[PDB]
């Protein structure tokens, strides 16, 4: 039925090395500061625009 | 000859070695001055110790965390 999976750690290392283009080089949530879902909801409720954010 | 006096905050900023010049850029427009720039032993992050006027300190943390792409942090 092909529902659950578990791998070994060199397999995960190789699949993480091959996928280096579709992934980001971020390490922590110090990025997305005032640029996440809750800040966008706050800018939605206050009817203001973040520079780079939606309108 | 009476004069007025304002409070000055002491500010310590934890930041990577690249955004230090951006910290010098941001503190330049809020009438402050950097007193100490010191590397942390055993860590690549630096510490910037400065004095700032308290009336200029509104939105200061937000200015650093916006201008240094969220890498610097201040108290």
From Swiss-Prot, chain A:
Q: Which domain of life is it from?
A: Eukaryota
> Which cell locations does it reside in?
Nucleus; Nucleus speckle
The free-text tissue note of the record is: Widely expressed.
The condition associated with this protein in its record is: Retinitis pigmentosa 13: A retinal dystrophy belonging to the group of pigmentary retinopathies. Retinitis pigmentosa is characterized by retinal pigment deposits visible on fundus examination and primary loss of rod photoreceptor cells followed by secondary loss of cone photoreceptors. Patients typically have night vision blindness and loss of midperipheral visual field. As their condition progresses, they lose their far peripheral visual field and eventually central vision as well.
Function in brief: Plays a role in pre-mRNA splicing as core component of precatalytic, catalytic and postcatalytic spliceosomal complexes, both of the predominant U2-type spliceosome and the minor U12-type spliceosome. Functions as a scaffold that mediates the ordered assembly of spliceosomal proteins and snRNAs. Required for the assembly of the U4/U6-U5 tri-snRNP complex, a building block of the spliceosome. Functions as a scaffold that positions spliceosomal U2, U5 and U6 snRNAs at splice sites on pre-mRNA substrates, so that splicing can occur. Interacts with both the 5' and the 3' splice site.
The record's note on quaternary structure and interaction partners says: Part of the U5 snRNP complex. Component of the U4/U6-U5 tri-snRNP complex composed of the U4, U6 and U5 snRNAs and at least PRPF3, PRPF4, PRPF6, PRPF8, PRPF31, SNRNP200, TXNL4A, SNRNP40, DDX23, CD2BP2, PPIH, SNU13, EFTUD2, SART1 and USP39. Component of the U5.U4atac/U6atac snRNP complexes in U12-dependent spliceosomes. Within the minor spliceosome, which acts on U12-type introns, interacts with PPIL2 and RBM48. Core component of U2-type precatalytic, catalytic and postcatalytic spliceosomal complexes. Found in a mRNA splicing-dependent exon junction complex (EJC) with SRRM1.
Name assigned to this protein: Pre-mRNA-processing-splicing factor 8
Q: From which residue to which, out of the full length, is covered?
A: 224 to 278 of 2335
Swiss-Prot record, chain B:
The domain of life is Eukaryota
What role does this protein play? Required for pre-mRNA splicing as component of the spliceosome, including pre-catalytic, catalytic and post-catalytic spliceosomal complexes. Component of the U5 snRNP and the U4/U6-U5 tri-snRNP complex, a building block of the spliceosome. As a component of the minor spliceosome, involved in the splicing of U12-type introns in pre-mRNAs.
Whom does it interact with, and what assembly results? Component of the U5 snRNP and the U4/U6-U5 tri-snRNP complex, a building block of the spliceosome. The U4/U6-U5 tri-snRNP complex is composed of the U4, U6 and U5 snRNAs and at least PRPF3, PRPF4, PRPF6, PRPF8, PRPF31, SNRNP200, TXNL4A, SNRNP40, DDX23, CD2BP2, PPIH, SNU13, EFTUD2, SART1 and USP39. Component of the pre-catalytic, catalytic and post-catalytic spliceosome complexes. Component of the minor spliceosome, which splices U12-type introns. Within this complex, interacts with CRIPT. Interacts with ERBB4 and PRPF8. Interacts with PIH1D1.
To which species is this protein native?
Homo sapiens (Human)
Coiled-coil ranges per the record?
Answer: none
Q: Describe the disease involvement stated in the record for this chain.
A: Mandibulofacial dysostosis with microcephaly: A rare syndrome characterized by progressive microcephaly, midface and malar hypoplasia, micrognathia, microtia, dysplastic ears, preauricular skin tags, significant developmental delay, and speech delay. Many patients have major sequelae, including choanal atresia that results in respiratory difficulties, conductive hearing loss, and cleft palate.
The family line of this record is:
Belongs to the TRAFAC class translation factor GTPase superfamily. Classic translation factor GTPase family. EF-G/EF-2 subfamily.
Taxonomic path: Eukaryota, Metazoa, Chordata, Craniata, Vertebrata
The gene name reads EFTUD2
List the protein's name: 116 kDa U5 small nuclear ribonucleoprotein component
């Amino acid at each position: 039925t092909y529902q659950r999976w578990q791998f070994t750690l060199p397999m995960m290392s190789t699949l993480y090395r091959l996928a280096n283009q579709l992934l980001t080089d971020l390490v922590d949530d110090n990025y997305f500061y005032l640029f996440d879902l809750k800040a966008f909801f706050t800018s939605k409720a206050l009817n203001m625009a973040i520079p780079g954010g939606p309108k | 000859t009476p004069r007025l006096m304002e409070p000055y905050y002491f500010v310590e900023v934890q930041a990577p070695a690249d955004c230090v010049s951006a910290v010098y850029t941001v503190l330049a427009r809020r009438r402050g001055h950097v007193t100490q720039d010191a590397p942390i032993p055993g860590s690549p992050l630096y510490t910037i110790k400065a004095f700032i006027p308290a009336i200029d300190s509104f939105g200061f943390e937000t200015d650093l965390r916006t201008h240094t792409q969220g890498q610097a942090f201040s108290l």
